[PDB]
């Protein structure tokens, strides 16, 4: 299978309460391995996965320096954009940045991406061709022209096919015991009578990795998406994920419904019947 | 690892 490394950054302007809050998190495919909090006491890049703690002090110094650089740039951009939209100085605003790169099973570079948002709306993104930028509003056209004049797309592309992919290969080779595993989901089913007429028949799948899983309901061959209420895949906390999908069924015909679970850790898509 | 720098918006 393919793999991916991503970095998430959130800067929140809290005027009057000091300098903006800045939080940075690093993920390898689903696993958080580095983090940084602008309010943390260490003020350093901290490990969060057991397979990243084995890096030398030079690595941690470099990552700390780069994180603080990102924080400085984002703290400047907060005021820049607050002035762009003529927004009040007392309002709290949020900049969110995500960038990363994907690799294949043999370790070859597949694609890369960067996306920046302001207050939860898309601000500026890197196109699929890794050579142009897509801007949402007129304020983002300024940043688009600014980054085009600064050859930023080329430098980012040189970062993606190089440093990014190489460090992702290193991370996959170092934490191969837990990052290349495929935990199959353990499935079961519960039945809760809502009233004397209808009942909720819930289909559970627990302890699977990664989080990509498909839960479907069938009434004798056809998928009925009129009552299927899926739920955000939640982290168990130990490294696995959980997900349930329920359906409201008239009491007396629970035997006509089937739950189908599709996951990469299962040879055949399982079928559950109450 | 991370990137080295980026241009202000």
């Amino acid at each position, epitope marked *: 299978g393919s793999h991916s490394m991503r970095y998430f950054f959130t800067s929140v302007s809290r005027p009057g309460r000091g300098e903006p809050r800045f939080i940075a998190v690093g993920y390898v495919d689903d696993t958080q391995f580095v983090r940084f909090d602008s309010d943390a006491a260490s003020q350093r890049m901290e490990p969060r996965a057991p397979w990243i703690e084995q890096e030398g002090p030079e690595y941690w110094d470099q990552e700390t320096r780069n994180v603080k650089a990102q924080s400085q740039t984002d703290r400047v951009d907060l*005021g*820049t954009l607050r002035g762009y939209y003529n927004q009040s100085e007392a309002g709290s605003h949020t900049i969110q940045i995500m960038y990363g790169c994907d690799v294949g099973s043999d370790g070859r570079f597949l694609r890369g991406y960067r996306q920046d948002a302001y207050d939860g709306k898309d601000y500026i993104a890197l196109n699929e061709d890794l050579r142009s930028w897509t801007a949402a509003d007129m304020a983002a056209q300024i940043t688009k022209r600014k980054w085009e004049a600064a050859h930023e797309a080329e430098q980012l592309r040189a970062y993606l096919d190089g440093t990014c992919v190489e460090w992702l290969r290193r991370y996959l080779e170092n934490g191969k015991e837990t990052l290349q595993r495929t935990d199959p989901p353990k499935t079961h089913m519960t039945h809760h009578p809502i009233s004397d007429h209808e009942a909720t028949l819930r289909c559970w799948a627990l302890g699977f990795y990664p989080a990509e899983i498909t839960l479907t309901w069938q009434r004798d061959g056809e998928d009925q998406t009129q009552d299927t209420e899926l739920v955000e895949t939640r982290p168990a906390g130990d490294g696995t994920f959980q997900k349930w999908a329920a359906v409201v069924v008239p009491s007396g015909e629970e035997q006509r419904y089937t739950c189908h679970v599709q996951h990469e850790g299962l040879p055949k898509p399982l079928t559950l019947r109450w | 690892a991370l990137h080295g720098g980026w241009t202000t918006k």
Partner: T-cell receptor
Amino acid sequence: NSGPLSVPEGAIASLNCTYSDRGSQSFFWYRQYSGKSPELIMSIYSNGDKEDGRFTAQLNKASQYVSLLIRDSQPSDSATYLCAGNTGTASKLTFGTGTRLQVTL
Amino acid sequence: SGVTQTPKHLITATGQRVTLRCSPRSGDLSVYWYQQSLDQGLQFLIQYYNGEERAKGNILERFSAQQFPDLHSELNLSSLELGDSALYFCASSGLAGGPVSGANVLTFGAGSRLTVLE
């Protein structure tokens, strides 16, 4: 690599640079006349070749090879040429051992 | 040029302290301090970004540096030795927020030559 080269006027000068740090991503050719300050003349980001005017930069990151090719050398090209590397827009530039080019008339 | 270093020439004795002032180009945020001796090439000393410290290289503890909120920087050298006689350069990169135009390059200053004598 330290010079000089002694390339006659009208010929093709070729400089190369020894860069220590293996972590850089973008490379730059600066020109510095004696006493003056280094001024940028070439920027290269992708592995391979790039050309601008009379200058042609070349990069192979896997072997840390950076090279410059000055076509039709003129007496106004006699200076020290330095290579630099960085990892971003405002990252630190680290310079390698530059080379002295002298164009004879 | 846009970058202004002061002074341009300075002659002091051993064990003294000197200060080098540098105002960057109008529109740049980051300020880099480099040292160039005859033996080696350009050695990276330090780099500040918008008042905060951005990068630090092989720099002695006798060397202090600062960037003021008006984006201009100062580099203070103490307990000067004969080997400290070199050419100290100040460059400015980084582009301030907004529609400010300019090339994404390092613009070096005229330099400041310091000679330490016994």
